[PDB]
């Protein structure tokens, strides 16, 4: 198996059960609500709900945010299989995950993203899927930039022939000419500041509006 | 040794060097600035700079935020020893760390907090130190709540006899009568929402103003 595409929950090694609490909250959300758009992924998804305004762009679209910080592809795959797509019939599912897949190759991460798209295509066949590219990270040039770029190439190639599957590069050019990423854009060179989120969210929002 | 009080940097096992970038940024901050207050700790400190307004309460006090998500006590101790207290002469240092010290007992975590206070007392003897209590976490009752409470008891007892060392319980009562924490307060039952931050920041700000 590709570990990136074998669905598995996060194991609690801390003791407070937070990841399963989040999953259960989302399951309840889907049971009780009727979203047009559901967003799922890692902290870049989750903190959009706080740290960008979410309220002005995405709230109007009738959206649920199932981001969880730290998730890898296989965790998002498990969550979609285990309740978060039940009781709903979204028009669009937005996926943003793979930057946390440490120890997986770029090809394995791509297989995890492809597996997520396929599950959504099975469980929610009416939905369009939007996959976001993995953003650059690290203050300076480093292997995860190359990795992330290579996933993006491979995912873009995989989705090119997919009528209702859409790859979106949301990066406005966070890596400057000198190789650096500004902490004004990503405060810790991974996570977006409010300023970082603006261009990202703008780009997503445009696409969503087109599709919708 | 108590692992919580043996200073050690976070080892990069991902490859993008972000933790050392953050440390180096803070070192540069201290080299170039003249804070009256420096805040140091984990993500509860770091995201105050974003996710609470920071700008209206803490900015006026001439403050630097050296929070880093994921740090344990020993990481904060290393960072203070390795450059982040150089070139400055703050009136107050605010410490908030120990919730991430997984695998350390409550007594070991307390020893790490005590070690941090002692280092600040050595390197910046004019400064008052403010330690925040560890907040509850997890949606429901769990061992980390008891752990965190027990650190708070032990730290409060340790600091009681310390003229210029101040323990602040900033918890307004996030654990409700039914044992639960609301995701409106902590979106993932650890990290504070903007709403969660308001009472916390209010309480800190009051204390700071008294002291100052």
UniProtKB/Swiss-Prot annotation, chains A, B:
The keyword Manganese does not apply. Its EC number is 3.1.1.47. It comes from the Eukaryota. Beta subunit (PAFAH1B1) inhibits the acetylhydrolase activity of the alpha1/alpha1 catalytic homodimer. Belongs to the 'GDSL' lipolytic enzyme family. Platelet-activating factor acetylhydrolase IB beta/gamma subunits subfamily. Alpha1 catalytic subunit of the cytosolic type I platelet-activating factor (PAF) acetylhydrolase (PAF-AH (I)) heterotetrameric enzyme that catalyzes the hydrolyze of the acetyl group at the sn-2 position of PAF and its analogs and modulates the action of PAF. The activity and substrate specificity of PAF-AH (I) are affected by its subunit composition. Originally the subunits of the type I platelet-activating factor (PAF) acetylhydrolase was named alpha (PAFAH1B1), beta (PAFAH1B2) and gamma (PAFAH1B3). Now these subunits have been renamed beta (PAFAH1B1), alpha2 (PAFAH1B2) and alpha1 (PAFAH1B3) respectively. This is Platelet-activating factor acetylhydrolase IB subunit alpha1. The gene is PAFAH1B3.
């Amino acid at each position: 198996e590709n570990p990136a595409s074998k669905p598995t929950p996060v194991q609690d090694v801390q003791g407070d059960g937070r990841w399963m609490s989040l999953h259960h909250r989302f399951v309840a959300d889907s049971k009780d609500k009727e979203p047009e758009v559901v967003f799922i992924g890692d902290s870049l998804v989750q903190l959009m709900h706080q740290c960008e305004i979410w309220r002005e762009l995405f709230s109007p679209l009738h959206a649920l945010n199932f981001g969880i910080g730290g998730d890898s592809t296989q965790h998002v795959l498990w969550r979609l299989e285990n309740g978060e797509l039940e009781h709903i019939r979204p028009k669009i599912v937005v996926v943003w995950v793979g930057t946390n897949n440490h120890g997986h190759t770029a090809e394995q991460v791509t297989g995890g993203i492809k597996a997520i798209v396929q599950l959504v295509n099975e469980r929610q066949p009416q939905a369009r899927v939007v996959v976001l590219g993995l953003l650059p990270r690290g203050q300076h040039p480093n292997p995860l930039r190359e990795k992330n770029r290579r996933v993006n190439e491979l995912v873009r190639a995989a989705l090119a022939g997919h009528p209702r599957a859409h790859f979106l590069d949301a990066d406005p050019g966070f890596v400057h000419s000198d190789g650096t990423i500004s902490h004004h854009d990503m405060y810790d060179y991974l996570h977006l500041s409010r300023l970082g989120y603006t261009p990202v969210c703008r780009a997503l929002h445009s696409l969503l509006l087109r599709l919708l």
